Amino acid sequence: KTVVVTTILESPYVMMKKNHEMLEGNERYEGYCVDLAAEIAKHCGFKYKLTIVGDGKYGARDADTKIWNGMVGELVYGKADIAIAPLTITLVREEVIDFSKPFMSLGISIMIKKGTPIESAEDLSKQTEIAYGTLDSGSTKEFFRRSKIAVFDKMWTYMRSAEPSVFVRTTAEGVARVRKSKGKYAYLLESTMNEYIEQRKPCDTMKVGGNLDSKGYGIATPKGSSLGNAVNLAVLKLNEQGLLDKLKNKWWYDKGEC
Amino acid sequence: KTVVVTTILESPYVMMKKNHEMLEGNERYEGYCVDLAAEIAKHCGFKYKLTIVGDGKYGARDADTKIWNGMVGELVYGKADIAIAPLTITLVREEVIDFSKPFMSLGISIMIKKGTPIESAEDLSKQTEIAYGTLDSGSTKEFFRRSKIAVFDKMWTYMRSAEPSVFVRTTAEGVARVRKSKGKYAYLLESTMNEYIEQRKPCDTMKVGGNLDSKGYGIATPKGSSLGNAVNLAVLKLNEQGLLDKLKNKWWYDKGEC
Numbered sequence: 001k002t003v004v005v006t007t008i009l010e011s012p013y014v015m016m017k018k019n020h021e022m023l024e025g026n027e028r029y030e031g032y033c034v035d036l037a038a039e040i041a042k043h044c045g046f047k048y049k050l051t052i053v054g055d056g057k058y059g060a061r062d063a064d065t066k067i068w069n070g071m072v073g074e075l076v077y078g079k080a081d082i083a084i085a086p087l088t089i090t091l092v093r094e095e096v097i098d099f100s101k102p103f104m105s106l107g108i109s110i111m112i113k114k115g116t117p118i119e120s121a122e123d124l125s126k127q128t129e130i131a132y133g134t135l136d137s138g139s140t141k142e143f144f145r146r147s148k149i150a151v152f153d154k155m156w157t158y159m160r161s162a163e164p165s166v167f168v169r170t171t172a173e174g175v176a177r178v179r180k181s182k183g184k185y186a187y188l189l190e191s192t193m194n195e196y197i198e199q200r201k202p203c204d205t206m207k208v209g210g211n212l213d214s215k216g217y218g219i220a221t222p223k224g225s226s227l228g229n230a231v232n233l234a235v236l237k238l239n240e241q242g243l244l245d246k247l248k249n250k251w252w253y254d255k256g257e258c
Numbered sequence: 259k260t261v262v263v264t265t266i267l268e269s270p271y272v273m274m275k276k277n278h279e280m281l282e283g284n285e286r287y288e289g290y291c292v293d294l295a296a297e298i299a300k301h302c303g304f305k306y307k308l309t310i311v312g313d314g315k316y317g318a319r320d321a322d323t324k325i326w327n328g329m330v331g332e333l334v335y336g337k338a339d340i341a342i343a344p345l346t347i348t349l350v351r352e353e354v355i356d357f358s359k360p361f362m363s364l365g366i367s368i369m370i371k372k373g374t375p376i377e378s379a380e381d382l383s384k385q386t387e388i389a390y391g392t393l394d395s396g397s398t399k400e401f402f403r404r405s406k407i408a409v410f411d412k413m414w415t416y417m418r419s420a421e422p423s424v425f426v427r428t429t430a431e432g433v434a435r436v437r438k439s440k441g442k443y444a445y446l447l448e449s450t451m452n453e454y455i456e457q458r459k460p461c462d463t464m465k466v467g468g469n470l471d472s473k474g475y476g477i478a479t480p481k482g483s484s485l486g487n488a489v490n491l492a493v494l495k496l497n498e499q500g501l502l503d504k505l506k507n508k509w510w511y512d513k514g515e516c
């Protein structure tokens with residue numbers, strides 16, 4: 001009866017509360033997606049258990065094993081009933097899981113340390129002094145891996161073979177690498193996160209250029225899941241009444257520091 | 259076998275070619291959605307007939323009759339198999355028809371004649387000198403009609419009773435009214451269209467303030483339609499390979515005039 005919700009620790013979507021070690025269950029977490037799960041759960045009338053993805057990944061299909069990892073894997077293999085997280089709706093995932101209409105719109109963007117002489121993807125692609133990468137097992141990397149668009153194909157060719165590896169295991173590590181590389185590392189990630197980090201101390205990073213592509217985050221459920229149909233309508237409802245915009249302001253700007 | 263596609267004449271989505279009177283069938287039309295239908299049809303392998311919505315409306319449910327009009331009505335009542343147009347994904351429509359993942363993201367925006375002293379929805383709502391309205395039988399009007407958000411509820415209260423009526427039957431009429439009202443009429447419409455018009459002669463209008471809400475356009479099919487599942491995957495594919503961004507640049511900017 002209790003719906004298992006898989007998610008991933010990613011600020012400001014899901015964060016441990018400062019005093020989480022004294023709390024149990026869902027109360028240990030806070031954030032935009034934790035607030036969103038709370039809303040969906042009560043408006044849809046069900047009990048749920050928030051569970052952090054074991055491997056801490058969003059989800060990609062291994063070429064060798066053909067196995068899905070991350071949150072996508074938890075849904076594909078029956079470990080979770082719904083994923084409420086900043087999970088990008090993409091063709092390859094849509095073939096194996098169901099997504100609700102987008103609860104948030106965004107795009108791939110470039111994060112640089114302030115002062116870095118880069119203003120766009122074209123600039124990055126036509127130079128080597130500034131290394132750049134993205135998150136492993138995420139949609140951004142798969143976007144670049146499968147892209148045949150000139151500029152993006154060139155960036156992928158560079159990234160897939162760059163040494164040291166330009167890929168990071170977590171967004172936190174990518175941001176930390178941008179902050180500690182003295183302008184020599186640019187990080188490709190979704191605009192929403194880029195925007196979030198831009199407003200967090202030490203305020204030493206910035207989003208440059210426009211978005212490279214346009215995507216959306218949706219709540220995901222196993223293919224042909226009964227719950228998915230209802231959740232999709234619940235998300236549409238929450239959006240129309242301004243709850244999602246309200247949540248965005250609360251977690252991005254009301255808590256900003258720059 | 260031939261899929262009936264309902265659409266609406268709305269530049270730059272669907273426009274009659276200059277020499278359409280000498281052409282027949284689908285060849286009479288051109289535009290972003292005509293290009294999009296052409297893509298979906300060949301990548302999904304089907305013949306189709308583009309058909310303009312009889313009443314020229316997007317679709318709303320009459321309170322008295324409870325009947326759906328516009329393109330939504332054509333799908334609900336079996337007159338068309340798919341609607342390929344700038345049809346906004348909304349809760350009330352989602353209850354009766356199926357939408358693909360968004361092929362375009364946008365939001366409600368304000369269109370004003372250049373020079374009009376209005377910079378936001380709050381400004382409009384706290385004054386009466388400048389009348390403002392939206393399109394009848396569209397999602398923007400239903401957004402305002404059902405909204406309980408303070409500012410939007412106040413604007414709806416004003417609009418529903420304003421005299422002369424602030425509602426227009428077509429986007430063309432709303433834009434014309436903005437252009438001929440000498441700053442005394444502001445028009446609420448989706449940002450994509452606002453952006454389009456801003457780049458068309460006489461270049462006397464402009465989009466002001468940020469978007470009031472965030473929405474998406476999806477391709478619509480009758481509920482539980484087999485075609486919908488496949489089209490949704492086709493749209494996801496087209497987006498990932500940059501066809502939609504390519505189409506946007508072609509119909510909005512490559513043809514701009516301001």
Ligand SMILES: CC(C)(C)c1onc([O-])c1C[C@H]([NH3+])C(=O)[O-]
Nearest residue numbers: 058087088138139140189190193
């Ligand atoms: C963590 C986040 C959200 C900033 C992100 O930034 N670049 C990405 O690839 C992702 C993950 C992506 N949303 C997904 O679902 O794989």
Ligand SMILES: CC(C)(C)c1onc([O-])c1C[C@H]([NH3+])C(=O)[O-]
Nearest residue numbers: 316345346396397398447448451
């Ligand atoms: C014509 C267009 C697209 C500019 C528009 O602008 N305001 C609206 O309500 C609509 C129609 C809407 N997209 C719909 O589906 O009802």
Ligand SMILES: [Cl-]
Nearest residue numbers: 160161162165
């Ligand atoms: Cl490597």
Ligand SMILES: [Cl-]
Nearest residue numbers: 418419420423
């Ligand atoms: Cl009236």
Ligand SMILES: [Zn+2]
Nearest residue numbers: 039042043243
């Ligand atoms: Zn609620």
Ligand SMILES: [Zn+2]
Nearest residue numbers: 162163164165
């Ligand atoms: Zn290496």
Ligand SMILES: [Zn+2]
Nearest residue numbers: 297300301501
């Ligand atoms: Zn094609």
Ligand SMILES: [Zn+2]
Nearest residue numbers: 420421422423
């Ligand atoms: Zn009247």
